[PDB]
């Protein structure tokens, strides 16, 4: 199916304790494969998946260089943000960046990203057409003008349609066994009595990949939306994910409810009944 490669970087200033910490991670779909931590002793891009260890010296030198340069860039970008908003140098601030691309089953471009966030809020994001920017406020509008003049959108466009797609294609092959697989969820259902009159039915989804899934409840066939409790899909640690959905059923009516599971590891949606 369709795949993605994402890079997430986080810069956090620490006034009085030196330079801001820069941490970056790389993802292919839901599998992390690299990391960079400015505080680490290695000062190198490090492997975080087996299928990336095969890359030669050139790769690890170039990636390191590129991420370290992104480290310094965000470093200056935090100081600029400070100036724009005229904020105190006593306050800690955050700067996040995400970039990457989406491909299809044939491995050709489908979508691209290049966006920033300051203190948790959108700052500037490259639009879908990869030619224009959306500046969140008047501080970002100053960056937007400068980037339009410097043809920044053209540079990232080329990376997102060229290098990003190619690197992703290269990874999907090298990690064929890992990244190109789907683990169907193991599904079952648990029952938990609160009182004499009610009872909780819980629907489980275990050991699935990728993380995208959908758990729904139905009674007699209708959809139990505003009464279903849902948790965030969560990693198991082994590379698979977990999730559950629960509804509070009147005692003696447990057989009215069915659990519905949608995962791309499942040819067709499943239907669990208690």
């Amino acid at each position: 199916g369709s795949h993605s490669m994402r890079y997430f970087s986080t810069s956090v200033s620490r006034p009085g304790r030196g330079e801001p910490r820069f941490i970056a991670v790389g993802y292919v779909d839901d599998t992390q494969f690299v990391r960079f931590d400015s505080d680490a002793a290695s000062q190198r891009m490090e492997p975080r998946a087996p299928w990336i260890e095969q890359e030669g010296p050139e790769y690890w030198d170039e990636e390191t260089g590129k991420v370290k340069a992104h480290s310094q860039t965000d470093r200056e970008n935090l100081r600029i943000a400070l100036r724009y908003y005229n904020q105190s140098e006593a306050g800690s601030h955050t700067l996040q960046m995400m970039f990457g691309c989406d491909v299809g089953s044939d491995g050709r471009f489908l979508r691209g990203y290049h966006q920033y966030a300051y203190d948790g809020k959108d700052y500037i994001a490259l639009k879908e057409d990869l030619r224009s920017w959306t500046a969140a406020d008047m501080a970002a509008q100053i960056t937007k003008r400068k980037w339009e003049a410097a043809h920044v959108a053209e540079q990232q466009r080329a990376y997102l349609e060229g290098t990003c797609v190619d690197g992703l294609r290269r990874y999907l092959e090298n990690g064929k066994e890992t990244l190109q697989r789907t683990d169907p969820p193991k599904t079952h259902m648990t029952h938990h009595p609160i009182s004499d009159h009610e009872a909780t039915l819980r629907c489980w989804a275990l050991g699935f990949y990728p993380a995208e899934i959908t758990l729904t409840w139905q009674r007699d066939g209708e959809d139990q939306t505003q009464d279903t409790e849902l948790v965030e899909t969560r990693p198991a640690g082994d590379g698979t994910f977990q999730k559950w959905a629960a509804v509070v059923v009147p005692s003696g009516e447990e057989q009215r409810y069915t659990c519905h599971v949608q995962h791309e590891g499942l040819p067709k949606p499943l239907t669990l009944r208690w």
Binding site: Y7, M45, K66, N77, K146
Partner: peptide, 10 residues
């Protein structure tokens, strides 16, 4: 593959 360096900060 990481995006090549860019300057022209904010």
């Amino acid at each position: 593959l990481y995006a090549s360096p860019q300057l022209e900060g904010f």
